[PDB]
Design an enzyme around this catalytic site. Sequence first.
Site, PDB file in Angstrom:
ATOM      1  N   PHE B  60       0.824 -10.354  22.949  1.00  0.00           N
ATOM      2  CA  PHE B  60       0.942 -11.476  23.203  1.00  0.00           C
ATOM      3  C   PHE B  60       0.248 -12.422  22.003  1.00  0.00           C
ATOM      4  CE2 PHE B  60       1.361 -11.782  27.789  1.00  0.00           C
ATOM      5  CZ  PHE B  60       1.134 -10.554  28.110  1.00  0.00           C
ATOM      6  N   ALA B  61       1.039 -13.335  21.715  1.00  0.00           N
ATOM      7  CA  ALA B  61       0.788 -14.237  20.620  1.00  0.00           C
ATOM      8  C   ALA B  61       0.999 -15.535  20.891  1.00  0.00           C
ATOM      9  CB  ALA B  61       1.702 -13.662  19.361  1.00  0.00           C
ATOM     10  N   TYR B  65      -2.473 -17.393  17.508  1.00  0.00           N
ATOM     11  CA  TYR B  65      -2.317 -15.872  17.313  1.00  0.00           C
ATOM     12  C   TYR B  65      -0.886 -15.514  16.966  1.00  0.00           C
ATOM     13  CZ  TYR B  65      -7.392 -14.943  18.793  1.00  0.00           C
ATOM     14  OH  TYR B  65      -8.317 -14.926  19.073  1.00  0.00           O
ATOM     15  N   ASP B 144      -4.497  -9.141  17.104  1.00  0.00           N
ATOM     16  CA  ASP B 144      -4.984  -9.230  15.958  1.00  0.00           C
ATOM     17  C   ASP B 144      -5.582  -8.146  15.216  1.00  0.00           C
ATOM     18  OD1 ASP B 144      -6.530  -9.146  18.398  1.00  0.00           O
ATOM     19  OD2 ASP B 144      -8.350 -10.137  17.488  1.00  0.00           O
ATOM     20  N   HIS B 164     -14.113   1.704  23.804  1.00  0.00           N
ATOM     21  CA  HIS B 164     -14.701   0.522  22.857  1.00  0.00           C
ATOM     22  C   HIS B 164     -15.155   0.985  21.746  1.00  0.00           C
ATOM     23  CE1 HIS B 164     -16.081  -3.355  21.941  1.00  0.00           C
ATOM     24  NE2 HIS B 164     -15.585  -3.901  22.869  1.00  0.00           N
ATOM     25  N   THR B 176     -21.625  -3.078  28.756  1.00  0.00           N
ATOM     26  CA  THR B 176     -21.454  -4.752  29.280  1.00  0.00           C
ATOM     27  C   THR B 176     -20.512  -4.616  30.436  1.00  0.00           C
ATOM     28  OG1 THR B 176     -19.870  -4.942  27.453  1.00  0.00           O
ATOM     29  CG2 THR B 176     -22.169  -5.411  27.089  1.00  0.00           C
ATOM     30  N   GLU B 234     -11.110  -7.424  30.687  1.00  0.00           N
ATOM     31  CA  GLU B 234     -11.609  -6.092  30.343  1.00  0.00           C
ATOM     32  C   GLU B 234     -12.699  -5.523  31.395  1.00  0.00           C
ATOM     33  OE1 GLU B 234     -14.805  -5.754  26.725  1.00  0.00           O
ATOM     34  OE2 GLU B 234     -12.756  -5.103  26.199  1.00  0.00           O
TER      35      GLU B 234
END
Lengths: 277, 277
Positions: B60-61, B65, B144, B164, B176, B234
């Site tokens: 996705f841009a 981005y 990114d 992660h 988290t 996430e």
Amino acid sequence: FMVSLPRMVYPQPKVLTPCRKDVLVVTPWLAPIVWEGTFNIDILNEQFRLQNTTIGLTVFAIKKYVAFLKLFLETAEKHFMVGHRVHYYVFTDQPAAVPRVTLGTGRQLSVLEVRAYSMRRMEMISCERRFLSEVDYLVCVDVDMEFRDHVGVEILTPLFGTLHPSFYGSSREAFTYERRPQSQAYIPKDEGDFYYMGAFFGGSVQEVQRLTRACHQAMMVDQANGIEAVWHDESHLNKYLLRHKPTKVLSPEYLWDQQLLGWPAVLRKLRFTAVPK
Amino acid sequence: FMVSLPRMVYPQPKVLTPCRKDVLVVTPWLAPIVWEGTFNIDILNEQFRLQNTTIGLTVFAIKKYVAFLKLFLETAEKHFMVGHRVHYYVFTDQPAAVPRVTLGTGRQLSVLEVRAYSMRRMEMISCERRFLSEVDYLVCVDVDMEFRDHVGVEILTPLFGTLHPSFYGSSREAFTYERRPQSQAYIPKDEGDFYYMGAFFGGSVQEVQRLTRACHQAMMVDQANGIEAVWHDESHLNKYLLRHKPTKVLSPEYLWDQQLLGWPAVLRKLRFTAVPK
Ligand SMILES: O=c1ccn([C@@H]2O[C@H](COP(=O)(O)OP(=O)(O)O[C@H]3O[C@H](CO)[C@H](O)[C@H](O)[C@H]3O)[C@@H](O)[C@H]2O)c(=O)[nH]1
Ligand SMILES: O=c1ccn([C@@H]2O[C@H](COP(=O)(O)OP(=O)(O)O[C@H]3O[C@H](CO)[C@H](O)[C@H](O)[C@H]3O)[C@@H](O)[C@H]2O)c(=O)[nH]1
Ligand SMILES: CCCCCCCCO[C@@H]1O[C@H](CO)[C@H](O)C[C@H]1O[C@@H]1O[C@@H](C)[C@@H](O)[C@@H](O)[C@@H]1O
Ligand SMILES: CCCCCCCCO[C@@H]1O[C@H](CO)[C@H](O)C[C@H]1O[C@@H]1O[C@@H](C)[C@@H](O)[C@@H](O)[C@@H]1O
Ligand SMILES: [Mn+2]
Ligand SMILES: [Mn+2]
């Protein structure tokens, strides 16, 4: 479609703590090698029960080998896939010599009569329609054996072989593969991952039928050419698993001979073991 | 149907020599954890090329981005699935800002225009008919980023997540995860295997559509109940992969930030890395 697992409380896997540091636990084609300490059986039992998995176990008891059935089946009842659906298929030339063994719930036994007298087992397994209708996985084992400890759903996968207990430490040139180029089972001295024993293999019904078909066809070619592989269907099994990599490999916990080989430090459990003959 | 592998000459795997002794290389549900030294890429390349495997890569841009696309795509050309069939799917609100990047043979790029402004990515992926017709696997990554080293067929499997890079050494209570019982993404402090990052997941088209559908539906329930999970999609990805165990887990080699975290001894390669923003 795979439904969600329920909440479960178990020890957290830790990325910077290996389970086992003494043995290879994954092949170079990313298939698990199944040793004690690599699996949480509670997680696996949940996953396989949620699919209502049925496991077929094939065993041949021809001529004097009918005498091994009582201990084989009684110990299978104690240790093999307990809690899951199991269908035993006993291939014998003596249906009346099959012992009456009491089975746990969800478990059944069929006696299949065959002719007496390496081609028989691969040909007989490649029963094709019946297995496809009745079970999800097939496990194919020697009868001159007993279960001493857990053999469960950790083994299940599309295709598996088992490390031969005599050769797991051997370099490939020492493996007793068929070495004559005239045989379909031929493997040269610079090829080979492992030496798998003929006494314990399995997988999905589809993959087991592929393997047994291929081995049967290869043995027929050899017969027509007047050659018999040095270790018979085991030689062909090894050729097949070289060219069609198994999706799990069972450690020698799953196929051991304590009389011959003792109890090395690397084996935390002896699960399925040779009976003296 | 999987045809036979050709003869290959490579080092013999040794049962009594682990590849890696410093890290966990298999999960407790017998999924490989992919680290350098665990795989022979020649074997895997053969297996996946013999199936004529096509890999879709979604990225996705949106808004600013789009500026990351040039480096993302040019480095993907150097390192991502080289030799295999690749279809890039670039989702953007600015089709004219997509850079003209020269592709190797067997590789194609589609620009898919979307609306600008966590629900978008999971909803957009769950394209359902197109992916099923065009690719075998889907890989879904952040834009990114840049490829610095090999990312290949070793990752492919029905369902994978990626550790992660900030949390691979953490105990589960420190993860988290979403901790409010009112959220669909809720995971209590005594549950959890790993903390997976939203920036790299994938699998077969079927399994990726299942995951993205489930996460989209869960996020919709949360929205209706006036709650937004602490780490957005996430948080839901983590809930999904807790209850639906991935069949491989990628190590942090596959998702790293060198500016933030340096280059620890445990990483032999830095494959796919954050670009400063
Ligand atoms: O008279 C017999 C002989 C064999 N079997 C069945 O065949 C199985 C295999 O035979 P063995 O246990 O005697 O042989 P191994 O398991 O030692 O097998 C290995 O040695 C064999 C030759 O002895 C072949 O080479 C075979 O491919 C290789 O795996 C037995 O468990 C049994 O199920 C019988 O039922 N009756
Ligand atoms: O304006 C934007 C913002 C995001 N993105 C796309 O969304 C991806 C993810 O966004 P970031 O890189 O900014 O965020 P992280 O990868 O840090 O993602 C993590 O943090 C997010 C909130 O910042 C969410 O919680 C998400 O679920 C979690 O994986 C980007 O790579 C990009 O592909 C855009 O295209 N345009
Ligand atoms: C002098 C006695 C025979 C004992 C020595 C046998 C050691 C090697 O095992 C044999 O290996 C062959 C392939 O090279 C083939 O698989 C048969 C296999 O022998 C069987 O399995 C062993 C582990 C033992 O249980 C053995 O008794 C059995 O026949
Ligand atoms: C003070 C600056 C921010 C740097 C500190 C971020 C460290 C933790 O990473 C973050 O973890 C979140 C879940 O707890 C969520 O996944 C976002 C994630 O941050 C992203 O990934 C990191 C590895 C970095 O690349 C970071 O810049 C990026 O935003
Ligand atoms: Mn035997
Ligand atoms: Mn990002």
